[PDB]
Amino acid sequence: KPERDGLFCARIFGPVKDYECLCGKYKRLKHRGVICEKCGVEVTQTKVR
Amino acid sequence: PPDLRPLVPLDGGRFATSDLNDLYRRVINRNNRLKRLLDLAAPDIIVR
Amino acid sequence: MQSWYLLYCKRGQLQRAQEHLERQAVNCLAPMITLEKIVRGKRTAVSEPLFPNYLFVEFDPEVIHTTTINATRGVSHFVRFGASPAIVPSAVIHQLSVYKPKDIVDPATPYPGDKVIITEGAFEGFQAIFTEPDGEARSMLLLNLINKEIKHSVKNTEFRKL
RNA sequence: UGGCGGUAGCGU
DNA sequence: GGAAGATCGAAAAAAGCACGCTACCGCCCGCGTGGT
DNA sequence: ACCACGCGGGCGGTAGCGTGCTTTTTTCGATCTTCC
Numbered sequence: 001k002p003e004r005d006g007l008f009c010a011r012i013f014g015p016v017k018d019y020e021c022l023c024g025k026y027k028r029l030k031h032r033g034v035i036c037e038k039c040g041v042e043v044t045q046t047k048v049r
Numbered sequence: 050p051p052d053l054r055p056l057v058p059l060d061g062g063r064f065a066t067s068d069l070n071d072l073y074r075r076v077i078n079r080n081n082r083l084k085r086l087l088d089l090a091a092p093d094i095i096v097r
Numbered sequence: 098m099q100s101w102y103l104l105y106c107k108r109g110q111l112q113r114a115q116e117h118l119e120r121q122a123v124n125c126l127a128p129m130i131t132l133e134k135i136v137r138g139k140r141t142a143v144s145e146p147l148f149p150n151y152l153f154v155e156f157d158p159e160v161i162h163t164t165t166i167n168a169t170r171g172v173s174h175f176v177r178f179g180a181s182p183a184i185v186p187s188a189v190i191h192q193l194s195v196y197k198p199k200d201i202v203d204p205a206t207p208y209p210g211d212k213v214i215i216t217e218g219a220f221e222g223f224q225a226i227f228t229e230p231d232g233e234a235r236s237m238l239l240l241n242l243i244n245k246e247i248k249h250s251v252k253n254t255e256f257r258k259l
Numbered sequence: 260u261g262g263c264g265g266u267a268g269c270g271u
Numbered sequence: 272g273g274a275a276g277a278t279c280g281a282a283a284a285a286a287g288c289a290c291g292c293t294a295c296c297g298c299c300c301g302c303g304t305g306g307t
Numbered sequence: 308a309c310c311a312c313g314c315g316g317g318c319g320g321t322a323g324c325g326t327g328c329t330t331t332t333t334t335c336g337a338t339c340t341t342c343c
């Protein structure tokens with residue numbers, strides 16, 4: 001998994017899995033566009049990386 | 050973007066690192082060292 | 098006739114380079130500072146070299162050549178600007194020898210009264226407040242959670258500084 | 260199941 | 272009538288060196304550390 | 308003794324490593340040569 005503020009950080013570039021938060025609290029298309037507050041990574045498709 | 054410089058798994062517990070990632074790591078380390086030494090009131094020669 | 102030069106040493110080989118240079122009768126200088134705090138814990142407090150990978154050397158080029166110093170074990174390369182190596186003025190050495198060391202702590206990771214994040218633990222992904230570093234590798238922090246804020250003790254490994 | 264380098268070969 | 276623009280050859284730096292395909296090999300930081 | 312990582316960077320050395328092209332472009336000692 002990526003680190004924080006690293007060269008691969010999810011907060012900067014995007015989540016590692018499509019419509020799945022890095023934390024894993026939100027893992028569905030319903031939370032699209034919602035930035036999770038525990039880890040600060042937006043729930044979007046992986047292609048945005 | 051990270052996808053343009055992927056970390057392809059080697060199927061043996063290791064990760065193949067592209068040259069761009071290594072160069073970026075070098076630049077980041079050098080910049081962090083420069084900031085740390087600037088915060089340390091280092092002499093002019095060391096800062097240069 | 099003696100001259101001062103700056104040398105960039107290898108990684109973790111400052112002691113070896115200093116010993117080798119002293120074996121060759123070359124004056125050596127490296128700042129010292131009593132400050133050392135990393136994840137390893139177990140009372141890390143010990144002196145560490147200020148301005149890492151830098152070493153000032155006083156010697157006469159006509160006695161010991163610069164190539165011999167460049168080939169000394171532990172020393173990586175001369176700190177050179179242009180073709181010729183840079184010459185450190187004596188005023189800089191004089192001012193750095195005595196009052197350069199300072200008690201100000203540069204690494205803020207062990208200092209209390211800060212804001213940190215936890216990489217892994219009982220409550221992952223929750224910011225914590227550093228207020229008092231009891232002992233070593235024992236960090237009591239005001240972890241914030243939805244149910245209740247808890248003054249919980251976690252290791253230095255558990256939380257990441259800032 | 261991804262590339263880099265080297266070597267050898269096929270077709271011009 | 273000794274200096275300033277011309278140049279002149281001599282030296283130095285840079286870029287390119289056909290395409291497809293096949294097979295093999297090796298390699299995918301690197302050594303100096305820290306707890307056990 | 309192994310297992311794991313963590314900051315750095317050409318290497319090992321108490322120096323030196325290179326060593327069979329052609330064409331284009333840039334710069335400069337040095338003349339030169341013309342004259343301000």
Ligand SMILES: [Zn+2]
Binds near residue numbers: 026
């Ligand atoms: Zn999340």
